[PDB]
Amino acid sequence: IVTQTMKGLDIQKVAGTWYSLAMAASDISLLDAQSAPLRVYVEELKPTPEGDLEILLQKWENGECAQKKIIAEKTKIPAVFKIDALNENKVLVLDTDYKKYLLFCMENSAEPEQSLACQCLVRTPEVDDEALEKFDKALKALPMHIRLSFNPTQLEEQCHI
Ligand SMILES: [Cl-]
Ligand SMILES: [Cl-]
Ligand SMILES: [Y+3]
Ligand SMILES: [Y+3]
Protein backbone atom coordinates (compact mmCIF):
# COMPACT_ATOMS: atom_id res chain seq x y z
CA ILE A 1 0.00 0.00 0.00
CA VAL A 2 2.41 2.67 -1.37
CA THR A 3 6.00 3.02 -0.06
CA GLN A 4 7.20 6.51 0.95
CA THR A 5 10.22 7.68 -1.08
CA MET A 6 12.59 10.67 -0.82
CA LYS A 7 11.09 14.01 -1.88
CA GLY A 8 14.01 16.12 -3.14
CA LEU A 9 16.58 13.63 -4.44
CA ASP A 10 19.68 14.94 -6.20
CA ILE A 11 20.81 11.74 -7.91
CA GLN A 12 24.19 13.15 -9.04
CA LYS A 13 25.25 13.42 -5.39
CA VAL A 14 24.93 9.66 -4.75
CA ALA A 15 27.91 8.95 -7.04
CA GLY A 16 30.80 6.73 -5.97
CA THR A 17 31.62 3.89 -3.60
CA TRP A 18 29.04 2.32 -1.29
CA TYR A 19 28.93 -0.65 1.06
CA SER A 20 25.85 -2.77 1.80
CA LEU A 21 25.78 -2.62 5.60
CA ALA A 22 22.32 -4.12 6.07
CA MET A 23 19.50 -5.60 4.02
CA ALA A 24 15.95 -6.87 4.54
CA ALA A 25 13.20 -8.63 2.56
CA SER A 26 9.53 -9.61 2.81
CA ASP A 27 10.26 -13.23 1.89
CA ILE A 28 12.94 -15.16 3.80
CA SER A 29 13.79 -17.22 0.69
CA LEU A 30 14.82 -14.06 -1.20
CA LEU A 31 17.70 -13.36 1.21
CA ASP A 32 18.39 -16.52 3.24
CA ALA A 33 21.32 -18.28 1.45
CA GLN A 34 24.41 -16.66 -0.13
CA SER A 35 23.05 -17.66 -3.55
CA ALA A 36 19.58 -16.27 -2.74
CA PRO A 37 18.07 -14.34 -5.73
CA LEU A 38 18.13 -10.90 -4.03
CA ARG A 39 21.27 -11.35 -1.94
CA VAL A 40 23.20 -8.62 -3.76
CA TYR A 41 25.92 -6.26 -2.58
CA VAL A 42 26.20 -2.71 -3.90
CA GLU A 43 29.82 -1.71 -4.51
CA GLU A 44 29.25 1.47 -6.55
CA LEU A 45 26.57 3.85 -7.84
CA LYS A 46 27.10 5.68 -11.14
CA PRO A 47 24.48 8.35 -12.02
CA THR A 48 24.52 9.17 -15.75
CA PRO A 49 24.48 12.75 -17.15
CA GLU A 50 20.91 12.15 -18.39
CA GLY A 51 19.60 11.41 -14.87
CA ASP A 52 19.74 7.60 -14.81
CA LEU A 53 21.47 5.38 -12.24
CA GLU A 54 24.05 2.73 -13.07
CA ILE A 55 24.22 0.28 -10.15
CA LEU A 56 27.42 -1.75 -9.83
CA LEU A 57 26.99 -4.77 -7.57
CA GLN A 58 28.27 -8.23 -6.58
CA LYS A 59 26.36 -11.53 -6.54
CA TRP A 60 27.19 -15.12 -5.56
CA GLU A 61 26.30 -17.73 -8.22
CA ASN A 62 27.72 -21.08 -9.37
CA GLY A 63 29.87 -21.24 -6.22
CA GLU A 64 31.67 -17.94 -6.95
CA CYS A 65 31.33 -14.16 -6.56
CA ALA A 66 30.40 -12.29 -9.74
CA GLN A 67 30.18 -8.68 -10.97
CA LYS A 68 26.85 -7.28 -12.16
CA LYS A 69 25.54 -4.03 -13.64
CA ILE A 70 21.96 -2.72 -13.51
CA ILE A 71 20.80 0.29 -15.52
CA ALA A 72 18.04 2.05 -13.58
CA GLU A 73 15.93 4.28 -15.84
CA LYS A 74 14.56 7.59 -14.51
CA THR A 75 10.82 8.19 -14.06
CA LYS A 76 8.66 11.28 -13.41
CA ILE A 77 9.29 10.79 -9.66
CA PRO A 78 12.96 11.59 -8.82
CA ALA A 79 13.40 8.88 -6.15
CA VAL A 80 11.82 6.09 -8.25
CA PHE A 81 13.69 4.26 -11.04
CA LYS A 82 12.87 1.42 -13.45
CA ILE A 83 14.93 -1.78 -13.84
CA ASP A 84 14.92 -5.21 -15.49
CA ALA A 85 17.10 -7.43 -13.30
CA LEU A 86 16.76 -9.81 -10.33
CA ASN A 87 13.06 -10.25 -11.27
CA GLU A 88 12.55 -6.64 -10.13
CA ASN A 89 11.17 -3.63 -12.03
CA LYS A 90 11.54 -0.76 -9.52
CA VAL A 91 14.27 0.89 -7.48
CA LEU A 92 13.12 3.29 -4.77
CA VAL A 93 15.49 5.59 -2.92
CA LEU A 94 13.94 6.16 0.50
CA ASP A 95 16.47 8.47 2.13
CA THR A 96 20.07 9.65 1.84
CA ASP A 97 22.32 12.38 3.23
CA TYR A 98 24.72 11.66 0.32
CA LYS A 99 27.86 11.68 2.48
CA LYS A 100 27.11 8.91 5.00
CA TYR A 101 24.14 6.66 4.16
CA LEU A 102 21.61 5.69 1.51
CA LEU A 103 18.46 3.62 1.93
CA PHE A 104 16.86 2.02 -1.11
CA CYS A 105 14.44 -0.77 -1.98
CA MET A 106 13.77 -2.98 -4.97
CA GLU A 107 10.41 -4.48 -5.91
CA ASN A 108 8.43 -6.09 -8.71
CA SER A 109 5.32 -3.95 -9.28
CA ALA A 110 3.21 -6.88 -10.57
CA GLU A 111 3.53 -8.85 -7.30
CA PRO A 112 4.79 -6.13 -4.88
CA GLU A 113 4.27 -8.20 -1.72
CA GLN A 114 6.83 -11.01 -2.10
CA SER A 115 9.50 -9.06 -4.02
CA LEU A 116 10.44 -6.24 -1.63
CA ALA A 117 14.14 -6.11 -0.71
CA CYS A 118 15.63 -3.06 1.02
CA GLN A 119 19.25 -2.11 1.72
CA CYS A 120 21.18 0.27 3.96
CA LEU A 121 24.25 1.55 2.15
CA VAL A 122 27.13 3.37 3.85
CA ARG A 123 30.07 5.36 2.41
CA THR A 124 32.73 3.70 4.57
CA PRO A 125 33.23 0.03 5.55
CA GLU A 126 32.03 0.66 9.12
CA VAL A 127 28.95 -0.15 11.20
CA ASP A 128 26.89 3.06 11.23
CA ASP A 129 24.30 2.72 14.02
CA GLU A 130 22.65 6.08 13.22
CA ALA A 131 22.09 4.88 9.64
CA LEU A 132 20.82 1.53 10.93
CA GLU A 133 18.26 3.32 13.12
CA LYS A 134 16.99 5.28 10.10
CA PHE A 135 16.96 1.98 8.17
CA ASP A 136 14.89 0.20 10.84
CA LYS A 137 12.61 3.24 11.19
CA ALA A 138 11.87 2.94 7.47
CA LEU A 139 11.36 -0.85 7.68
CA LYS A 140 8.67 -0.43 10.37
CA ALA A 141 5.88 0.31 7.87
CA LEU A 142 7.15 -2.54 5.66
CA PRO A 143 6.30 -6.24 6.03
CA MET A 144 9.84 -7.56 6.49
CA HIS A 145 10.51 -11.15 7.60
CA ILE A 146 14.29 -11.34 7.14
CA ARG A 147 16.92 -8.79 8.21
CA LEU A 148 20.69 -9.08 7.70
CA SER A 149 23.62 -6.94 8.86
CA PHE A 150 27.35 -7.27 8.18
CA ASN A 151 30.57 -6.61 10.11
CA PRO A 152 33.38 -4.27 8.83
CA THR A 153 35.58 -7.10 7.51
CA GLN A 154 32.62 -8.62 5.61
CA LEU A 155 31.93 -5.24 3.98
CA GLU A 156 35.39 -5.35 2.36
CA GLU A 157 35.37 -8.99 1.23
CA GLN A 158 34.04 -9.96 -2.19
CA CYS A 159 30.35 -10.91 -1.80
CA HIS A 160 30.63 -10.32 1.99
CA ILE A 161 32.50 -13.60 2.61
CL1 LIG B 1 18.56 4.59 -21.70
CL1 LIG C 1 37.19 -1.40 11.43
Y1 LIG D 1 17.92 6.62 -20.13
Y1 LIG E 1 36.86 1.03 12.00
Quote the CA–CA distance of 72 and 138 in Å, as a whole number: 22
Q: Give every CB contact of residue 119 below 8 A, 6+ residues apart in sequence.
A: 20, 22, 23, 24, 42, 103, 104, 105
| Three-state DSSP state, 144 | coil
Domain ranges of the chain: 1-161
* Residue 2 CB coordination number (10 Å): 6
* Residue 49 CB coordination number (10 Å): 6
Distance 40 CA to ligand 2 centre (A): 22
Distance 26 CA to ligand 2 centre (A): 30
Which of the 8 DSSP states describes residue 31?
A: T
Distance 16 CA to ligand 1 centre (A): 20
Residues 16-39 as b/e (b if ≥16 CB within 10 A, e otherwise) read eebbbbbbbbbbeebbeeeebbbb
Q: What are phi and psi of 84, to 5 degrees?
A: -145, 65
| Three-state DSSP state, 139 | helix
List the resolution, Å: 2.5
| Three-state DSSP state, 106 | strand
CATH fold for the domain made of 1-161: Lipocalin (2.40.128)
